[PDB]
Design a protein around this ligand. Structure first.
Ligand SMILES: C=CC(=O)N(C)Cc1nc(C(F)(F)F)cs1
Ligand SMILES: C=CC(=O)N(C)Cc1nc(C(F)(F)F)cs1
Lengths: 305, 305
């Protein structure tokens, strides 16, 4: 037992990371089959990034202006295109390490593993969630652009995120692998409003179920509540309203623990109204919302890839 | 910027994990060059584990009693030995994926990445620390035995931990790759005292430096203190006493931020005496001690492997 914030094994993705250089800018790319994906602002100089005309900038560029390197291996670029906010560089070689993979656009509240890279080399891996306002709270220094987020379901890598920017507020924004930004964000250096964030209520409930499974039970009540009564308190405290879809998803954890979902909601209500009294739950002094119900089940099931 | 608990990329280690089965028990092994390392209690049945005579049990075993499988590949066992609390199985093949590697025995307070495995397949990766009492707070379900902890310094994998047991108290215990347990623990199913844990003071100071680097500054004081005065408060609150060796190690962070180490100690003192007032530091409502000074520098430097 025990419960930890746990990233997927990153081997399959390590073998897809390359370095992409264009003019002066170098960032990371994702080499799958015979295509390399990377943020399109690799073609920006530090003067352009206030309001770049990407079409006009890409037009000054030809295949040989893009340097793609896989470790020491140089790749030959035989085609280039812009799809939304990503560049797709066609290379004459297929990545011999290409995993089985999908491109997916995740929903707010879902989680994924991030492999932070610089100059095409992996530096570390960590788990995070797509916030309800479509930002993520990551660790992304300059040059981490092109780092990708992913999930793995037995041998299949579902890529869901590519890092593009840090906002002036210190949070992060990026696209799906088709180049569409999560959220209202654009790839230019300006002040951009992320908007009010909220807490992923269903994830907090999964984490409280994770805690009961692992012995932390001090927060269980002699009380219950109603979906609508609880949502009243969710509103006051900026929690996502809970729905019947969420209740269903928590079914498996309700059945493993024998604690009705609404009873668990009643425990959450009291934790929101009375704080935690300097106590801890799974080693945390606040309510953690970056575990999906699927995440919790994975850890307690021991699923492998 | 941003600061996250970050594991090393696990690719190099994924390619070394194998399944080891002996009689009925199956757990994970580490296949390096032409040797497979695994916990010696793979030769225990569920009756033996109260007080097993490992020599007598190993004597009933021959090479062909050990089944080693690397994915689908079966390995031929041509030799077996017991070194402290690990088995070393000689196989007729060298792992073509063996990285450059060392076996190292870490000190309490240092960190490492854990690749949790079941049946020889990787399930996830996370960072943790060797507690001062020589336990770790991990996520280890049954069959995770043989999972290994490691560090990576540009291409070199320093293996430092192999998982053996969960203690009745829910914490975890294991050995170095020479089979010597960290701490006073033995591989039998009995109640074992871990002993008073303490907080890794130097790590907390590194994390406060990480917070200043990333904008969280509300905890900085108009006060300073002395090494001996601060250690008085460390004692009361079960913090490791701070030494001049620790002060030196924090030098680089002292210089990057312009905050003298003893001034930072003064901030820690006040946080220990007055709590955090329902505020947060790098998203945490308690004092985090699982980042070494080296860890913090790595994240803010962007080191790659
Ligand atoms: C990955 C981020 C990074 O490395 N940097 C230097 C920030 C940048 N932001 C832009 C954008 F989106 F404003 F055009 C281009 S580079
Ligand atoms: C890795 C732990 C695990 O999977 N289990 C079932 C607990 C075990 N503990 C023992 C020991 F050390 F007491 F002999 C043998 S198996």
């Amino acid at each position: 037992s025990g419960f930890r914030k746990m990233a997927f094994p990153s081997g399959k993705v390590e073998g897809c990371m390359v370095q992409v250089t264009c003019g002066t800018t170098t960032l990371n790319g994702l080499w799958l089959d015979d295509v390399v994906y990377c943020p399109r602002h690799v073609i920006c100089t530090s003067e352009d990034m206030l309001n770049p005309n990407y079409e006009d900038l890409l037009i000054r560029k030809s295949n040989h202006n893009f340097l793609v390197q896989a470790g020491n291996v140089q790749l030959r670029v035989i085609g280039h295109s812009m799809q939304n906010c990503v560049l797709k560089l066609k290379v004459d070689t297929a990545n011999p390490k290409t995993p089985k993979y999908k491109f997916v656009r995740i929903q707010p509240g879902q989680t994924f593993s991030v492999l932070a890279c610089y100059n095409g080399s992996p530096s570390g891996v960590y788990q995070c969630a797509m916030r309800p306002n479509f930002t993520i709270k990551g660790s992304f220094l300059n040059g981490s652009c092109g780092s990708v987020g992913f999930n793995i379901d037995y041998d299949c890598v579902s890529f869901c995120y590519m890092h593009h920017m840090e906002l002036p507020t210190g949070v992060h924004a990026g696209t799906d692998l088709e180049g569409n930004f999560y959220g209202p964000f654009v790839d230019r250096q300006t002040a951009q409003a992320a908007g009010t964030d909220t807490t992923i209520t269903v994830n907090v409930l999964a984490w409280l179920y994770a805690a009961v499974i692992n012995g932390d039970r001090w927060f269980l009540n002699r009380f219950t509540t109603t979906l609508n009564d609880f949502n009243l308190v969710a509103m006051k405290y900026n929690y996502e309203p809970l729905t019947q879809d969420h209740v269903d998803i928590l079914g498996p954890l309700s059945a493993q623990t024998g604690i009705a979902v609404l009873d668990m909601c009643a425990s959450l209500k009291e934790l929101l109204q009375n704080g935690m009294n300097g106590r801890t739950i799974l080693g945390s002094a606040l309510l953690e919302d970056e575990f999906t119900p699927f995440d919790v089940v994975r850890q307690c099931s021991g699923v492998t890839f």
